[PDB]
Amino acid sequence: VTLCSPTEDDWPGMFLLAAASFTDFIGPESATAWRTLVPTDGAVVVRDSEVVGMALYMDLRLTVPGEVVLPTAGLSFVAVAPTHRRRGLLRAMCAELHRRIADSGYPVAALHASEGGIYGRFGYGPATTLHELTVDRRFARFHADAPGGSSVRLVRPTEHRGEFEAIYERWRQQVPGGLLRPQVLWDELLAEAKAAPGGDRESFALLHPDGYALYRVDRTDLKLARVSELRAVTADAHCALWRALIGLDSMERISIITHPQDPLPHLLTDTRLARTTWRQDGLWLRIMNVPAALEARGYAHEVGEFSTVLEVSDGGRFALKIGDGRARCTPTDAAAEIEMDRDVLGSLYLGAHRASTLAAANRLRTKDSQLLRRLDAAFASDVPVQTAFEF
Amino acid sequence: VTLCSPTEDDWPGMFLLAAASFTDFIGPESATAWRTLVPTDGAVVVRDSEVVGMALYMDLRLTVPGEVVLPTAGLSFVAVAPTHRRRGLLRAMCAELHRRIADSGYPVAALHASEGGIYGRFGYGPATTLHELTVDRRFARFHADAPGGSSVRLVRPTEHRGEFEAIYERWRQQVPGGLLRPQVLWDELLAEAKAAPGGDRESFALLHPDGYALYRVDRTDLKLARVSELRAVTADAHCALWRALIGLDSMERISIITHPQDPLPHLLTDTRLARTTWRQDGLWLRIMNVPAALEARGYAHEVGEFSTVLEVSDGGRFALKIGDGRARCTPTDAAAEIEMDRDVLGSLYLGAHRASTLAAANRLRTKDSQLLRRLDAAFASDVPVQTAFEF
Amino acid sequence: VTLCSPTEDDWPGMFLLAAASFTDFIGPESATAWRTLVPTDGAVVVRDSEVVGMALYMDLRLTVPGEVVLPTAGLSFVAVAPTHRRRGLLRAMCAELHRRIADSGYPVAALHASEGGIYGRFGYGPATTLHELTVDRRFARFHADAPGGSSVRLVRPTEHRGEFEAIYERWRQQVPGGLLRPQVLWDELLAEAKAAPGGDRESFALLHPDGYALYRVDRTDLKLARVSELRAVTADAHCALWRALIGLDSMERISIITHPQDPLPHLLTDTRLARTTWRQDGLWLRIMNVPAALEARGYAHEVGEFSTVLEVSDGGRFALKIGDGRARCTPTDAAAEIEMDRDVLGSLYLGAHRASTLAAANRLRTKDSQLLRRLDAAFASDVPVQTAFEF
Amino acid sequence: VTLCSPTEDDWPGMFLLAAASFTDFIGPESATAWRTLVPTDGAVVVRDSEVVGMALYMDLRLTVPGEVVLPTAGLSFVAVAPTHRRRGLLRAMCAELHRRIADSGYPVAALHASEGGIYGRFGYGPATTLHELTVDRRFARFHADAPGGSSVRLVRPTEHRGEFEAIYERWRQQVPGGLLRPQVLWDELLAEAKAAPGGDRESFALLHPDGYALYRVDRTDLKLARVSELRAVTADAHCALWRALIGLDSMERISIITHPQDPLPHLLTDTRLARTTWRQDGLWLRIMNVPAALEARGYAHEVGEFSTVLEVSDGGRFALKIGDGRARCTPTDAAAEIEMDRDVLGSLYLGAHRASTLAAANRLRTKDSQLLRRLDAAFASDVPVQTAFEF
């Protein structure tokens, strides 16, 4: 059992482990596009010889509150062979990649979790929330106040790549949770827009100057349209796209994976028709450098200047001063007024979870309720946190 | 077709309409307890003779942000005979009760809606959100940080009426959404705690000095425990009660109807085990007197003093100044900076919906994004808004 | 193994066999009302001692085409103990009751079949067709042509017994399939209109001068209303009752067991909303005396006078002359032009099945296609055949 | 927004709209065969540029009662972009095609409806009824009277194209509802008889000199055989084919979409085993020229000569005389004795719906019940109306 950066000779063994571990992993061509985002020394393997564990990170750009873009290490392709469970391989691979990520200068790492109970203990906190809305479009009527009461076109996705790329780039720079989507991932997205024999139906696009929706009819439920992606930069675009989707007269239901502040339900005379059918953690964050992360993000201007001492368990103790939408985080040995594990800070960081909610579970400990109200307000995001794309 | 306050002679016809309209309405004894909350002149009927429509309000006490208690008219028992649909009976009954409620001095009216598309047009906005959590208790493990790692007792509800009454009274005065629960409604709750032949199983209670949970095994799914009510005044009580519920070793699943900020998921090593299985509007609010309602509630101290001009459609135009957690609302003919229908104000009022979410659906119109951020912050509640009991 | 008319001493053994054979049979009081319709010598039992088989008939009045009412022997309470199958007990009981029925002067016998494959071989043919319609009332809109665009009242069934009795009496005399419903069966119907603990919900009535509907919410599906009985004497009544049922705004679906010519679907702008969810044989008929039955019923006036020779297998050969809506059936030894088993004649008799459909299955044999067209036309009923009540 | 006959340049935009509107539409090759049936000027498009609406008709030959074949315009490929709903595009396209169809000389138009509530208002009435029968073949036993108690062969459909073509041609000329099936549609049918990866299983044929059945095992339910098409010219063929289908000993169930007078249930000792699992409108008809349509069809000989005055709403008033199986329809200003919308006449026209059923819904208005009986009898079809193939 040894832990190494893989050589080219290791990749067939990594693709066998991948196929056996991930039901979405078709075969080696599955990985080509994503591999271009893995830096030199971004991957570790464990050999017993054969490959019994693997983990890597990709170079990403994540938008955080204040429209600040952070270099982010996206952990992905993590697998332990079913023959090698409970032998400390995940712990060993995560410790080595975290050493490399921190030494390389990334202030944050991120991942999407296969189960909820694994990554907390490695300092990742869930930072975005996925909300599935299912609309019974047969009853849906737009409110008299709704915008746009056509600027939308029904198009073939492959013929409008340029326009999708440009709208997404505007959206990802404005919204916390936004990720830069490189060219190779647009290649993969547009390849999945094709019908497959025995697989997905063809995807169609609704295109507005300031938004798009990509949707396909369900494989088996022919009265359900699933919107894979909806990116809108303006309220007018968001409403115009939903008017077009509610015009899919052959469907009974339209489902989308969105965020908890999606305004859709308020566009309709009956808010109850936009039903929440599923909710789950989206992106998880591990803050790698506490002061660099806290200083980088913008904070709410509504809260007056305040100072506190924050201790992150095994993460340092810092004097935190927040004023004029900005934070100064400096080392101190003064008594801590707030204490939390690293994972909790990652949950607070994009505004998805309130400090006072975490305090009520004792995940965040303070004796000052005023300080809690001030952190709740300051860490809030003006623009609601969304989830970009899974990795 | 005439609209009158009912005489005693009208009540058998009202109970026939009730039985035919409401599947929960067993018979006349169904109504006795609730009728004691209906004031003189709190009820209207439409006769064609026989009873073809009815509506009433009850005298309630609703807690709003800042622990302020408002007299509230609770609309209930609203029904139109299936023989008399689309003849303007609902409009006529709602206009007459709203006249009586406003003339009597209530600043707010409230209801629970049978469907989402009816009450918006009468100025009611959804003001609380019901979130059903279903926990797979076989996997649930408490986080190392969770409190209480027994102060809880398994008891017969009927033997501890005094202690439930006293805990609920503390909870309803502290939480926005809280309602005073009068003696007659405790009589009805404890009567429903009994097993019924062909109906519900017996209810049990978990009792802590500072909280209680009332739960029963599902009629048909014998591995599901449904928690009808959980009221906890402290974090320690909330965690101790959930430790006891996760100790129902004969169950697979525990379900509760709670609110979106319930800290339960953060108590567990796997936050995903507390699954959101259902979400719906809870209490709806109609603001009857705009300035009296806005002046009564407390506002967030974190936001600096600011002034604006708010226009409610057909509700008056007012100069609104919010500072030091308090608001002054006075009549003005100055140009409006914010405009919204009455229903939108009711949705904002307890902090359940953000002004910026309503603005993105064009339900709230302003040309100032700074003003929107300030209203979002000021209307926020420090204590998350919960739903008391249905009526 | 002996076959006898039961003594009073036999009835406890008959009620044990009944309880074990029929899931609807609660206990001895189940039978009291129905027993008053069983004549002296209307029942047979087989003893092995204990009761191992039973069968009886009731005295009924059946309406046939031309508004003619026939004395009818209604076979019911037929059971063989599970210990005594395949020993010829059913054959022995049916042969003895048929001897008694024919000797007593009944021209027809009738029954409702527990399975489709038993009674054909004893000369019963299915003569009515049950069609279940399920309406998604949320979408239902009445056509501009539909009548009545309120004469209907929502009432308690027990308070309007007189009016239901009088409407049903008019309906049963006008419609083929109609049965006289005696006082004891009204007592039983109105007793089933009560809610039962663990059983059915309370029944309500919609009452028009010229029709009624009795309906109840489903035990388990609380968004389904089941109409147990709808009797309307005029088109206006039928349409007015359906307007009231489509006004059950708390339901998603309304289901009724009706007949194939129910005009309901044509009342709606979308005929497809009245969905056929179930179809089955209703009343079965055994013609006991061929000439008396054929002479009694009226025939279509549109068909010109014609003569043929009909042979019923083991039922006699007759010269049949049909003209001016009337038939003369007289014995002959002349060559048969039409041949069929007794069961086929029972299927033709109320107009539910076409002679040309039975001919295409070779159940009716003729070499004359003109004769087939003439029988199809003559045996047709102007008023569509309905099913009264099960027995 | 302009309405034009499409140029070749319009067809890619029409195929995009088709793919987005119709789940069965695979791609451009989907349309080749069907396009050969569209005449010059048989298609309209709406451009906004891009294609936002389309509609066309095909040249068909429809059999009506009396074995008369009418030129029929088959409306198909009707779609409005989801971006352009509720703007009058369907009304505009239907008005233009109806002008072209009427000017070209077609006496009737026909379609298959995607929903039941759209085409009535454009004068189409449902004229055939689809009845799905599902047989539990494990219990099915043929009656002693059933024919053929082997002339049937199990064959590969592609090897017997000539024999299927010749049997179908005999069937379509004899049955009302029959359509000429041109060579290109046989090419498409036999191409769908092939297995597809991820799609349908291989089709097999049962072939008799005087009938055929094409059947395939269900994709997912491997104990269900679905009969796509059964065409039999004689009773012997129909019975022999069902004997072979009931010999599919590896199946539990055989399902077919047939018509309400299918004699199958009468072939079995238990008629209940042929269960009605689904019922729906099949072909819809718009009578374009009232007198030409009424004069063309044959009428029942059993009804004596009679005369009336029929008014079709916005369709003309005519003196109708029916005798000796023939009708004379001539213009008159005499008072109408019968009145109905154009759609109602289309529902009556092939004999699928009775005049007296439509009268009971007030869709057909007369003060003469004798006249109603005479129309019911005269419009009846001797050969039951069937549905040929969808388009």
C207 strand-pairing partners: C153, C212
- Residue whose tokens read 């206990």: C27
Distance CA B72, CA B109 (A): 5
The amino acid at residue D125 is: G
Residues in D whose CB is inside 8 Å of some CB of A read 16-17, 19-23, 48, 50, 52, 80-85, 114, 196-199
Distance in Å from the first CA to the final CA of chain C: 28
Distance CA C253, CA A327 (A): 59
CATH number of the CATH domain containing B306: 3.30.1050.10
* Alpha carbon of residue A247 to chain centroid: 30
Which among C86, C74, C84, C71 has a CA at the least distance from the CA of C45? C84
Shared domain for C344 and C250, answered yes or no, is no
Which stretches of chain D are assigned E, i.e. beta strand?
2-4, 43-47, 51-64, 68-80, 108-112, 125-126, 129-136, 153-155, 204-208, 211-217, 224-232, 253-258, 274-281, 283-287, 306-312, 316-323, 326-331, 338-340, 364-365
Min Cα distance D5 → chain C (Å) is: 31
Among the candidates B286, B319, B344, a domain finishes at B286
The neighbours of chain B, by the rule of 3 or more Cβ pairs under 8 Å, are A, C
Structure tokens at C244: 């009231």
Distance CA C150, CA B1 (A): 11
Among the candidates B263, B286, B309, a domain finishes at B286
Q: Is C26 exposed, middle or buried (0-12, 13-18, 19+ CB in 10 A)?
A: exposed
Q: Are B331 and B318 in contact (CB under 8 A)?
A: yes
C319 within some domain: yes
- Residue whose tokens read 């109905």: D340
Which stretches of chain A are assigned E, i.e. beta strand?
2-4, 43-47, 51-64, 68-80, 108-112, 125-126, 129-136, 153-155, 204-208, 211-217, 224-232, 253-258, 274-281, 283-287, 306-312, 316-323, 326-331, 338-340, 364-365
C387 within some domain: no
Residue A154 CB neighbour total at 10 angstroms:
25
C365 strand-pairing partners: C339
- Sign of the torsion angle spanned by Cα atoms B301, B306, B310, B316: positive
Q: Is B270 helix (H, G, I), strand (E, B) or coil?
A: coil
C390 within some domain: no
Distance CA C180, CA A308 (A): 89
User: For D335-346, b where at least 16 C-beta lie within 10 A, e where not — what string?
Assistant: ebbbbbbbbbbb
Tell me how many helices (H) and strands (E) chain C has: 10, 19
Q: Are A142 and A131 in contact (CB under 8 A)?
A: no
Q: Are A48 and A84 in contact (CB under 8 A)?
A: yes
Whether chain C lies against chain B with 3 or more Cβ pairs closer than 8 A is yes
Residue A197 CB neighbour total at 10 angstroms:
8
Cα-trace Rg, chain A: 22
Q: Are B62 and B108 in contact (CB under 8 A)?
A: yes
Shared domain for A93 and A143, answered yes or no, is no
Q: Is D238 helix (H, G, I), strand (E, B) or coil?
A: helix
Resolution (A): 1.9
Number of CB pairs < 8 Å for A and D? 49
B390 within some domain: no
C77 within some domain: yes
Structure tokens at A346: 């990652």
Which among C76, C82, C93, C84 has a CA at the least distance from the CA of C24? C76
Among the candidates C281, C305, C331, a domain finishes at C281
- Sign of the torsion angle spanned by Cα atoms D297, D301, D307, D308: negative
Question: For residue D85, which residues of chain A lie inside 8 Å, CB to CB?
Answer: 247, 249
DSSP assignment of C78-110 equals: EEE-TTSTTSSHHHHHHHHHHHHHHHHT-SEEE
Instruction: Extract the annotated binding site of B.
Output: 78-80, 86-91, 114-115
Sheet holding A306-312, edge to edge: A326-331, A316-323, A306-312, A338-340, A364-365
Distance CA A74, CA A147 (A): 38
Which among B55, B31, B32, B53 has a CA at the least distance from the CA of B43? B55
Q: Is A289 helix (H, G, I), strand (E, B) or coil?
A: coil
Q: How many CA atoms lie within 13 A of C383 on its CB side?
A: 20
Min Cα distance C46 → chain B (Å) is: 38
Distance CA A81, CA C192 (A): 65
Shared domain for C253 and C351, answered yes or no, is no
- Residue whose tokens read 């026209």: D349
B387 within some domain: no
Shared domain for C248 and C344, answered yes or no, is no
CATH number of the CATH domain containing A154: 3.40.630.30
DSSP A391: -
Q: Are B129 and B276 in contact (CB under 8 A)?
A: no
**Residue A116 to residue B235, Cβ atoms within 8 A:** no
Shared domain for A349 and A369, answered yes or no, is yes
DSSP D101: H
Which stretches of C67-203 are assigned E, i.e. beta strand?
68-80, 108-112, 125-126, 129-136, 153-155
* Residues of the domain holding D330: 287-382
Shared domain for A158 and A250, answered yes or no, is yes
Shared domain for B69 and B114, answered yes or no, is yes
Strands C68-80 and C108-112, sheet pairing: parallel
- Residue whose tokens read 């109105």: C190
Q: Element (H or E) spanning D360, and its range?
A: helix D355-360
Q: Is C278 helix (H, G, I), strand (E, B) or coil?
A: strand
Question: For residue C247, which residues of chain B lie inside 8 Å, CB to CB?
Answer: 81-85
Q: What angle do CA A327, A328, A331 make, to 5 degrees?
A: 140
Q: What are phi and psi of B33, to 5 degrees?
A: -60, -45
Min Cα distance B231 → chain A (Å) is: 14
Structure tokens at C254: 């309304």
Strands D129-136 and D274-281, sheet pairing: antiparallel
Report the residue of chain D nearest A204, measured CA to CA. Answer: D20
Shared domain for A49 and A123, answered yes or no, is yes
**Residue D302 to residue C303, Cβ atoms within 8 A:** yes
Sheet holding A211-217, edge to edge: A153-155, A204-208, A211-217, A224-232, A253-258, A129-136, A274-281
- Residue whose tokens read 């140009």: B335
Q: Are B330 and B318 in contact (CB under 8 A)?
A: yes
Distance CA C171, CA C179 (A): 9
Min Cα distance B2 → chain C (Å) is: 14
Q: Are B298 and B292 in contact (CB under 8 A)?
A: no
Shared domain for D186 and D248, answered yes or no, is yes
Q: Are D305 and D130 in contact (CB under 8 A)?
A: no
How many domains is chain B built from?
3
Sheet holding C125-126, edge to edge: C2-4, C43-47, C51-64, C68-80, C108-112, C283-287, C125-126
C389 within some domain: no
Residue D277 CB neighbour total at 10 angstroms:
16
The neighbours of chain D, by the rule of 3 or more Cβ pairs under 8 Å, are A, C
For residue A239, give every residue at least 6 positions away whose Cβ sits within 8 Å of its Cβ, in sequence order, or none.
A142, A146, A147, A148, A267, B361, B362
Q: What are phi and psi of B253, to 5 degrees?
A: -130, 145
The amino acid at residue D114 is: S
Q: What angle do CA B347, B350, B356 make, to 5 degrees?
A: 55
DSSP assignment of A10-38 equals: GHHHHHHHHHHH-TT--STHHHHHHHTTS
Shared domain for D148 and D122, answered yes or no, is no
Distance CA C344, CA C379 (A): 13
Q: Are C249 and B84 in contact (CB under 8 A)?
A: no
Q: Is D133 helix (H, G, I), strand (E, B) or coil?
A: strand
D387 within some domain: no
DSSP assignment of D83-94 equals: TSTTSSHHHHHH
Distance CA D4, CA D25 (A): 23
DSSP B24: T
Shared domain for B245 and B305, answered yes or no, is no
Instruction: Extract the annotated binding site of C for acetyl-CoA.
Output: 78-80, 86-91, 114-115
Shared domain for C53 and C183, answered yes or no, is no
Q: How was this structure determined?
A: X-ray
Q: List the alpha helices (DSSP H) in chain A.
A: 11-21, 29-35, 89-104, 161-174, 183-192, 235-246, 290-296, 342-349, 355-360, 369-379
Structure tokens at A211: 């938004």
Q: What angle do CA B266, B267, B272 make, to 5 degrees?
A: 55
Report the residue of chain C nearest D360, measured CA to CA. Answer: C235
